[PDB]
Amino acid sequence: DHDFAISTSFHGIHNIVQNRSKIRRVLWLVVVLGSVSLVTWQIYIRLLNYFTWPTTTSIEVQYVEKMEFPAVTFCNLNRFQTDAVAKFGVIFFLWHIVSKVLHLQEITANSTGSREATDFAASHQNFSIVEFIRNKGFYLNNSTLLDCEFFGKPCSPKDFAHVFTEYGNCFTFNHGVSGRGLSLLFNVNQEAFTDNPALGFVDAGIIFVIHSPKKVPQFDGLGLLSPVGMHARVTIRQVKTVHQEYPWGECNPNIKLQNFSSYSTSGCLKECKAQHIKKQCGCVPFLLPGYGIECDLQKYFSCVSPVLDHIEFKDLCTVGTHNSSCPVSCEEIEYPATISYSSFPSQKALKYLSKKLNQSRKYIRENLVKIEINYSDLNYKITQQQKAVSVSELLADLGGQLGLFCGASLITIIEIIEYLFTNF
Amino acid sequence: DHDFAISTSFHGIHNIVQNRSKIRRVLWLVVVLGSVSLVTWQIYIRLLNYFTWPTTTSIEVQYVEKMEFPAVTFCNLNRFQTDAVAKFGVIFFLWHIVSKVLHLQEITANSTGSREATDFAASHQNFSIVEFIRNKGFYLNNSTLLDCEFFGKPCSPKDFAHVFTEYGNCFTFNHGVSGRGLSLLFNVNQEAFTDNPALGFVDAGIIFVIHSPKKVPQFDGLGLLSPVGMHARVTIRQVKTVHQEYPWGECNPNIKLQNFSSYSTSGCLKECKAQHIKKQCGCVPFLLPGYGIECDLQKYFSCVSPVLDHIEFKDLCTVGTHNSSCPVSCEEIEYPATISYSSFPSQKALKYLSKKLNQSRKYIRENLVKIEINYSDLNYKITQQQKAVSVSELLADLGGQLGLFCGASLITIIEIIEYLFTNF
Amino acid sequence: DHDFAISTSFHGIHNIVQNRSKIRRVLWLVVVLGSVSLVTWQIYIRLLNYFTWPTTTSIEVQYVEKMEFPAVTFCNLNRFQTDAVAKFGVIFFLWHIVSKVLHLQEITANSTGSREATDFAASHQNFSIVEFIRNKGFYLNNSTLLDCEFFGKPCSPKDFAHVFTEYGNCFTFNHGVSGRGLSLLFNVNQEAFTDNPALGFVDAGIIFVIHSPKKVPQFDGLGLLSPVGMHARVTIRQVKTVHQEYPWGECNPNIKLQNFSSYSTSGCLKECKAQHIKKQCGCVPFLLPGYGIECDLQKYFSCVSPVLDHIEFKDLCTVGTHNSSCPVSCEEIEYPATISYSSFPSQKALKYLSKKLNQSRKYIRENLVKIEINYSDLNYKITQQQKAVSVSELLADLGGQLGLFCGASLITIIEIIEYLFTNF
């Protein structure tokens, strides 16, 4: 055992053989023990750091000669045609009740409008809200859309897809090279269209949102505005973010949507909502994709509203955090926007448009909206969360801890076998 | 010595023993010397890099289901009640002189208004500016605040705290779940309120700032605006930044504010200002916390203004850099905002509000302001400056330099002792 | 050979000598071979990672008591003086043809305006467009610029430099301490100035851009707007980015502009454009720096427009990517801006300005624009792309791979020489 111990490849062990003295041998053995203990210390420390599943964040600017341009959704701040609602006021409260699925506000059950709506529902249960709103709501034609240009080229209403939202009859664009982009001129027409001030909605103009082609708009408090009588210029850049899985970040790719749709936060949320409503009530609302039987109107007062209140109160639906019901998507793309304004009907131009439209000098300043949406930069920002230590990396670093200390990988094990025989 | 030298644990030393030739021994000794020199080189290099006190910057998106919502401060762009100032024009110049503490502008000493203000100060030294402005300034009641909603729920004036600022009688909100947020409707009332055009302030509307609950608003050129007759929608996200200490960044935690208030850049600045004014003049102005005796009006013309001019000229007060009088705080939270607009008095709604307020159609369009402030995203950005090398890390890396070269930690020292005995 | 092999400094080699058994020697030799193979594996892996030329991205906040303030460029949304154009309508189409160099749009060759412009060009080839526009275009004097203040101090028109752009007669500011900054009051004068609605330009107001002192404005869809009758407040921060060379980023410093001008993306682009036009056509347009002979008017219809169409179609000019004709600059500085508005002519102030300007209560609200531009912080963001591995770094890391495995740098080579002799 002495020959192997002396021949063992270690600085202290070699020193023990060289000095050939009791005090010397003990001192070198102690030095070796301390060095290996520090090695172990470092090892452990660095391994516990890896077992935090640590991350680094990179952020970089990416470029192309011709980028894809995001979809847009437009709505009239005024809902309904004047004529079709003057004699049918209860429609406002009926629509507010139906749109709970979206707006998630609360309505005083004791209010007079609620009583009238409940009476009508009890009297006309065969009435169809969607078939009505799709006809008497905001409409897009030659009468409404005076002009539209994408990239120098003309555009026509037929290019616009149709979507239901809070406001009803919401139209979308570009549905599924720098400084240039989409340009429009709307005739908001406060003579035809109207809304109930009582419920708010006291403001006139165009409301729009910017989203990916394959997403559904949200609106709510996230929707952008443009006023009557001013040209709005909107300059945007694409922004992309990337997330890692549950150990390192919050992404949960494993979750997939019904109908084989690509994952999206909003999608997840609303699909959860629909699942709860259907399972508890057996029907689904009109403002959600065709999961199944559309709910009867009476169910909205009897079933849907209490169910939504319960969902809200119990927090059955959650967003964001890794434990959440609706985790953050792997990748997301946002379109930040900055807005500047200019007086639209120039006095020179005002008479011209007057002539053009055969409209009074009062009407044009009270009804027309011009919008431009433009790409500020042919480059876009990507932000990537990255795993700070791969398995392999651990290996590389593992060796490091030993550095500055007794330099050995197999000698320590070689001595361990020597000790095992020495102890056996 | 030869036995120890031959037995010394080093590649070149082992080669010297193996070859047993003069040329061979010299060649291996030279190779070992070069390897250790490169080791040292690397060592030194990496240590000099550590002694730059280097940093890395991480940036990451953090989540909660219901965040805390920032405080807000509102002011009227028009200062004073018409009635109380029609016969007391000197008040404008008096207030401008008093507000030097804040606005830090310059006033022509030869101007007629300055002469009149100086005469009044010489005649009515017992006059109290603050007791006047708190009564004849902008006020917030049922008459002024037509509506206020926080998160669906009603809000009332009593919820609003009172604060003095440049504009006087500045009211704050929320003083010390997604897409939703605060909504208001002000009656700015250009019949009652007024201001001196001569001094600027030619523009009518609401001025507001967004800040942390526990901070004091700054306004100045950093305040946001909303016009008369348009609904402003303001969409915000919380933004947080973190800084390291003087060796790595600019933070100086050691500095604490009087009255045991948590550190803040602005707070530091203004406290410094107050310290200088008090020590040099023995009094403090009304627009700063109650450090001590409020300054008499005459002191403003005689003492305060020259002192502020001297402070400005001599740069006695500084912000930002680590040497500065007012270093950057450890952590800071900002609220970037994007604004969109829409015509507020819809023709339908205009008659309604007319009726409601018993006001002319002319009055409403030229006096009302609507504001919404909303959280765009239940996630907030944090940016962290981080120390790129810990003490421990140095240890780990220290080892690396030796890598690729004569692999040893204690053998080099072992040979050093062998050389010491060899030389002794 | 046996003595050297046994004496060779390696864990397995030492074990081979110690055990002195065939099975033992083979096992230790295999262990050593596996360890060195893993070493090599790691080595290779990490070297292939280095040969991706990887990068890390830092982003940090930098500070000064008094920063330099960016230049600004202002233009009138209305081009031409009414008087000089009422009898000379063809000027609109002529200018549109000339400005192709900039706007890069398309004009219907069959349009009546095009025919009239072509006839005039065929009739008045000695006509000079630039000498006309510089006189009948937008002008800046006491009549136009009611007020201008930089940092508390007065400013005068003579401070403004003159520049040609799309709009013609574009004036610039500040040409080659916190919250404060530039403030202006323009008289846009829709009585004097005008434009052709037919071609768009239906909107009235001031259009401006923010750029570095030493750059040329671009405008196009990247220009900011301010409306008539509202005070605009613009809050900005400086933003700086840094890029690495072709192996790591996309910067190509080697490219320099003619006339010894510092590199700029836009500059590169336009210089390329001018080079192509001159070489193919032998002349240059007026809206580009004085490369040489200014092109005759007929050339615009005959030569310049087809050449620009060909350039567009063939993609002879490119921006951004490392292969591109116009690579990204080493460093770039941008000025993001956020805008808020307030009703400009307060009813108190309205009469005052009426008196001042001797103008009607109609005229002021229909013609005046007020702008402020301010610095949001005494601090600016820099973003730096950084080479993630230096040559030296490779050395350091090279060692790491060997770590955790047979610990040797020269012993492996020492054994290699032993094997070479063993095989020879």
Numbering used by the authors:
A (entry chain A), B (entry chain B), C (entry chain C): 38 to 213, 224 to 471
Extract from the study:
To reveal how hBASIC responds to Ca2+ removal, we prepared grids of hBASIC reconstituted in nanodiscs in the presence of 2 mM EGTA to chelate ambient Ca2+o and analyzed the sample using single-particle cryo-EM. The overall resolution of both classes was lower than hBASIC in the presence of Ca2+, with both class 1 and class 2 having a global resolution of ~3.4 Å. In accordance with the electrophysiology data, we observed two distinct particle classes that differ in their pore conformations, which we thus refer to as ‘EGTA-closed’ (class 1), representing a non-conducting state, and ‘EGTA-open’ (class 2), representing an expanded, conducting state. In hBASIC, Ca2+ removal induces a rotation of TM1 and TM2a away from the three-fold axis, resulting in a 4 Å helical displacement of TM1 and a 6° rotation of TM2a. EGTA-closed resembles the Ca2+-closed conformation whereas EGTA-open is dramatically reorientated such that the positions of the L425 and N426 side chains are switched; N426 now facing the vestibule and L425 making contacts with the β1-β2 linker. This is reminiscent of the conformation seen in the MitTx-bound open structure of cASIC1a41. Removal of Ca2+ triggers a 4 Å lateral displacement of the β1-β2 linker, repositioning the tyrosine residue and promoting rearrangement of the β11-β12 linker to open the pore. Removal of Ca2+ leads to rotation of the TM2 helix, displacing these residues from the center of the pore and expanding the extracellular vestibule. The gate is significantly widened in the EGTA-open structure, having a pore radius greater than 2 Å, which is sufficient to accommodate partially dehydrated Na+ ions. Removal of Ca2+ causes rearrangement of this loop to displace the histidine and increase the pore-radius from ~1 Å to ~3 Å.
